[PDB]
Design a protein around this ligand. Structure first.
Ligand code: FAD
Ligand code: FAD
Ligand code: FAD
Ligand code: FAD
Lengths: 414, 416, 414, 416
């Protein structure tokens, strides 16, 4: 093949839809799951995308693509009432249903296929499957995603504690407890906190929301800042000193630790409403580390330290929801071709401006996992079509889908 | 040489039909337009003015989102899609929509600008239309998209001076602001947009600003989502099947469609009035329930006699400027005179246009785009249903549904 | 006494706090309930007023009076909380709790006292209890309110059907059924429909909403039509021919049949959300009168006629909620004084511009129940302070609280 | 004449104290103000401008809603309460709040206008204060409400030409728009208000418009409700008891406080750039991460040397007009020199303001309004506080809590 995509969607899925009309390119994608499924553990009732529907799979690169969210609604017979709904943001299960509708309309996807290991023979890349099948191509696109992150204070933890990755499946058991505690900030943490707080006077549990963030940061979604999600900002950002880039990565607040401002205010309105009937058994703590964690009987003892104040405190809770983020890890299957991959000074891929990670500037491409190289655009649905069109532009020698070089009104470079 | 159909007039409705029929090789008719190029209501291109419907109400999207004439594709070609994505506004600006349609119009090859239709005949089972210049086109079908010309009350017919209908406001604005008195007659979106524009500079020119309307209130555009479901195929079929007397009642009772103002515009008009009033009394005047009964010019000044209808009292205003935002009205063009016997009429002498949007004896020969409120209610002049109607028209020009045409879209049931 | 207030709704309770600091005025108020209680039974969680908080008991006539809503929050220790909430509309239970707080701080209210008879002897009005006690004064202020209305077609039906006046207390039984129907439109009708919907997939019921109105009318509170809730419009409106005012009263819809537009929108948004999981067992019907209703088994058979189309249809549902309006009926306790009261051509009170209903034009005052003479302003909480200060103006002969003559930017009279 | 306290300066904070002290018989101080009458930041009275805090942040309400000096009472007396009720806007206009403040000061008798305090020393267990006229006022307590004068970067000290600080924009606007080039330095609400004002008329005057700021982003004002709980008594109880190094650190990192823009204003700026750009390229530049390090004037034009700090590159801009929106900063007034021995300072040389808002040896003799970010965080220059701060000051002047003082208002816990 020309290329082989490992892991499908929503970034590699978008590439599948973008190359299907290109006959000059024949690539194939292998996904481990039996069918496409997004973050199904966060499918709370009413939950919606944090980016408008134009950040779908194709539209930002080609609004005429047959796999656009608008065309999907037209086929489902739902376009007109969506027109009446007049909401830029699709609901989460609506988006999950849309990409599954797109994946099943393609012919170049092989589900139930977990790649085992990769290496490099005869200037081609060989990829091995769990079943034993082996594909080969000159290029590979890595869209394996970002596994959930667990703090080391919860390594080797036992009990029924969950990452927010699997909340919907275990809300069954959480509401039956006497006390629930959520660790970390971010959209998922607040969505879960609002969901539990909404029924706190029916199940009767205590509700704790602890985070080390100094504030409950709002998502940085004012339009002048949204212009940093731009081709010309990546051009600027990428040629900065890598330590200043790793500092901008570490300092960034709203990207992974940011809550929708509306959700923040709805949480306050709900706290106000419940507090009319009497004292609400809830706690919201900031500037608080999670240092220790142990399981006894069927309750957890968590040791926190208020870093700013310089004092420790412990809380006990039978339920434990780790709304900690996600973190990319070197996949095991790229061990035999590590010396073809280029690394930075800190131990991760130094992804090039053209989203390549190997000795040739156009060999293996990397979707996501590039905040230290492309900042907030790396895990953004709104920049999936842009990154895929540049990966296309390197697989051919041509620009099949036009690639904008300036979108913003402001200048980031000089 | 005889075509399948001839489109007379190139407004947003016929232009959308042109964009929807271009990928159909089984069809190919021709479009005749008076203007040298596509031009919308340019006399209302006020700074910041925008559409009353979301951008999906473009020429094609609601029938085919993959169409190359989408508004989104237009933004992609001009290098503006990502900035529009950040703008996060469903409503394109008026000049933005005007440039988009002109961009789509010059992408087509089926449009004849600068030709006005003079005659329409029926001969040899075909329709024969002639140009001012004498050019003659023939086709089996006709699609009339002539729009609705501006309406002028009879109290203003044959009136002297420099008074304007709101359709020419931008061209005469620099001369209006020089006057010491300006009066706006009628309600609706355009009247409020003009009032807000003049009120915003009332402090630098020093004119009086009068806004008089016959409607009992400043109606809002009825744009709540359950009422939006009345803009459905379900409601049209319900509505079309009811007695004609009940149909003509409900269009007369229609408030928000032609005489409605965007609620947000109403509230910033009030906010602006609150703002200006802090510095002292502002020379403005907002009157309701007032009909314009007579008007006369003298001294470069107008004397307009009004009657408060429900209070039963008369009064009149003296103003140097006069802006008539009295809306528009369809008049049957005389070029249809040679085939009037071929057309369907109702009790009050208007077109009894079918559910398939047909106005002739065949029920499928001559189609009519706008000017059908008494038959399809608020659907007729709505950009959000231009792709639906064009889909129905294409369905009968062909023998097949080229684009899918929805059966039901709402959660309500209007019939039983 | 100088006046006797019959009934302690928001209007008469407002008059009670506006007259407390006036020493030259000694009035007293008789309420049937043992304490103040607003429209409980519509106290849905999150429900709120339809007018901003300065439409309380005093502020629009005297922002300095100690019975303000803001002073109430200051004493409860909730002002800064309310300040951050930045919402103009208080919650229903919050307003109800506030009015009771003001009522109990007063000296002039006698709870648990139902008035049985009014009479007039030697130029005084004699008011007698059902307990047997007797009060008499020179003036009367009737704040009886407007009791629920039921469309006669449901007179003397068996079952368990309710008026929306009793929704909260019967909700636990309503959800048990498999079919619920709501008749009539308006704010609470939609407040109930949106409450039953949203849990339509946890219980098993079908949900029917049937109204006679042609639209789901929005409570249109655009600021220029809100200027019709002004003294100058009442001066205009009252001096109209009463045939025209009876036409205006009947033909405009929205005052009692209007829904909050944002409530309409989330009703649609919720319908859109539920419909993703499959067809929703709900029906929204317009233009349809309720002509007949029966009850055999635990099921209602209701005969409807869609008057616009001219066709009949019936609906069988175990549950029946009558969200119809409220209607004023002249109380029987004013029978011995009936010939001292003024009536119009249609047989109801010809209320003066000064809100009087008797021959003197300044002896008996009537709160509410004056739409045919004062239009939008009579059942409006925002005009309760205006009307009360005009009542105080006639009792004292002087304007204790300033009474605005004009407030709007437009002119209604010419 | 020996009073209880003498209040120096009459801004919103000391005026609020004047309104909360008038109904207190046990207290009678006196207020000295340089200006002939109250006047707020008039140099930023752009049309439509409004407060950043709701109207309850007036002079009294958050301490006593029944006060006769409340904003709502002011509207009632002015005959404007009902349409403000219809306006349904939490935020008074700047000109509205300014008129409201003069209306309250005129109603009091404790204010001396046109008096400038020149010297304060400590004699006979009393504070003496001397005015420019030479009049003497004596009291044991002082309340310092002199505000914060404008700040000018050292690159602009001794600069020639007609450059202005943003605090005088209204008076210089008519001459700025005449120029060919205007450049705005710094970010924040005022900087963005000025940029939007000039950008709105960029195609009528034809100037180039430059907006240069050192901040890496265009920060929105941190006004989400969970953050707004940080301006609370319990937070500054927690904040004040922190190590001074940590306090000065968090004061320095503060973004939205003085360098934050209203998010709605950011969005309407982008929308306005989108609207103007339709008509062609708009001659304006928005630069960030840029520090101004040198400036000079030659023949009516400024040449400004900037450094993109993050990128590590230099660049220069030439502009005829220079607007410095560089904020404000407190400086110890020279009239406190003879009493410097009695004032408490911290390690970096600033007032070690008590949590009771005192700055003197006795912890209750001299009180400081504003200029206390390093000890009271976002609360010190906030109109939402100041009512709270005045009640605490009155509680130290008296021995009793005259107005209730909240100790907890938030749902979240800041301390452990
Ligand atoms: C709840 C939630 C909501 C979000 N919402 C948004 C939003 O609105 N907008 C936005 O821009 N971002 C959003 N994000 C962030 C980000 O865009 C999403 O996480 C996105 O789904 C990640 O896309 P991805 O393709 O890079 O990774 P993934 O979606 O995680 O794709 C990884 C895929 O690779 C497969 N895989 C794993 N191992 C192998 C293997 N060995 N071989 C083959 N396949 C393998 C996995 O099964 C999976 O299907 C959200 C994140 C979360 C958690
Ligand atoms: C300012 C304004 C804003 C509006 N905004 C909206 C909105 O946001 N949404 C909405 O749904 N509706 C809107 N409307 C209402 C409606 O959509 C418009 O009236 C719309 O432009 C109607 O287009 P049309 O195709 O019916 O005809 P028109 O736009 O009126 O065009 C008819 C064309 O036919 C040509 N023509 C006439 N006679 C002949 C002839 N004999 N031969 C050849 N050509 C001829 C004319 O020159 C003209 O170009 C708006 C109306 C106005 C006035
Ligand atoms: C659910 C609901 C919400 C509303 N929300 C708003 C809103 O947001 N804004 C607005 O402007 N309007 C609103 N209204 C309309 C109007 O403000 C209310 O109807 C209002 O409560 C009317 O109060 P009232 O003083 O007329 O008497 P009511 O509140 O109706 O009650 C009068 C009192 O008189 C007592 N009484 C009756 N008979 C006797 C007797 N014989 N002797 C002694 N006492 C007696 C009753 O016990 C009762 O306590 C709402 C109405 C309803 C039903
Ligand atoms: C344009 C602008 C808008 C703002 N908007 C808000 C807002 O919406 N909300 C908010 O919370 N904060 C706002 N602020 C911040 C802050 O609340 C205001 O700056 C506020 O005016 C500060 O109050 P102050 O009394 O301490 O200062 P000032 O109002 O500046 O008080 C200084 C006064 O003291 C007088 N004075 C000084 N020295 C002497 C002396 N020696 N003798 C006599 N008199 C003297 C001066 O003449 C002047 O009248 C804004 C600031 C600015 C610049």
């Amino acid at each position: 093949h020309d290329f082989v995509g490992i892991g499908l969607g929503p970034f590699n899925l978008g590439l599948a839809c973008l190359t299907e009309p290109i006959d000059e390119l024949d690539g194939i994608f292998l996904e481990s799951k039996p069918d496409f499924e997004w973050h199904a553990g966060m499918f709370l009732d009413g939950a919606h995308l944090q980016t408008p529907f134009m950040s779908d799979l194709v539209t930002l690169a080609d609004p005429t693509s047959p796999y656009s969210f608008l065309n999907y609604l037209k086929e489902k017979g739902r376009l007109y009432s969506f027109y009446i709904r007049e909401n830029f943001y699709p609901l989460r299960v609506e988006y999950d249903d849309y990409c599954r509708w797109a994946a099943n309309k393609l012919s170049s996807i092989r589900f139930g296929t977990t790649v085992t290991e990769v290496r490099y023979e005869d200037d081609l890349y060989v990829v091995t499957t769990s079943a034993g099948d082996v594909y080969r191509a000159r290029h590979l696109v890595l869209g394996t995603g970002t596994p959930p992150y667990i703090p080391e204070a919860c390594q080797g933890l036992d009990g029924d504690f969950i990452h927010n990755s699997r909340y919907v499946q275990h809300r069954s058991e959480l509401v039956k407890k006497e006390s629930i505690t959520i660790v970390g900030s971010g959209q998922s943490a607040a969505e879960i906190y609002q969901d539990l707080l909404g029924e706190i006077d029916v199940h009767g549990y205590r509700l704790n929301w602890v985070t080390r963030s100094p504030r409950f940061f709002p998502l940085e979604y004012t339009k002048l800042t949204l212009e940093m999600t731009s081709p010309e900002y990546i051009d600027y950002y990428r040629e900065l000193p890598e330590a200043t880039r790793y500092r901008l990565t570490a300092e960034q607040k709203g990207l992974f630790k940011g809550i929708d401002g509306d959700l923040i205010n709805e949480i306050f309105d709900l706290l106000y409403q419940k507090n009319l009937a009497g004292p609400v058994p809830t706690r919201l703590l900031t500037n608080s580390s999670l240092n220790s964690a142990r399981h006894e009987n069927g309750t957890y003892t968590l040791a926190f330290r208020q870093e700013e104040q310089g004092k420790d405190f412990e809380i006990e809770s039978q339920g434990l929801v780790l709304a900690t983020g996600y973190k990319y890890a070197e996949p095991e299957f790229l061990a035999p071709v590590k010396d073809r991959l280029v690394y930075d000074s800190q131990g991760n891929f130094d992804v090039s401006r053209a989203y390549a990670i190997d000795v040739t500037g156009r060999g293996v491409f990397l979707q996501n996992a590039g905040v230290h190289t492309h900042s907030i655009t790396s895990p953004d649905l709104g920049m999936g079509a842009y990154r895929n069109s540049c990966i296309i532009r390197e697989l051919l020698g041509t620009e099949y889908y036009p690639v904008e070089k300036t979108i913003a009104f402001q200048e980031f470079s000089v």
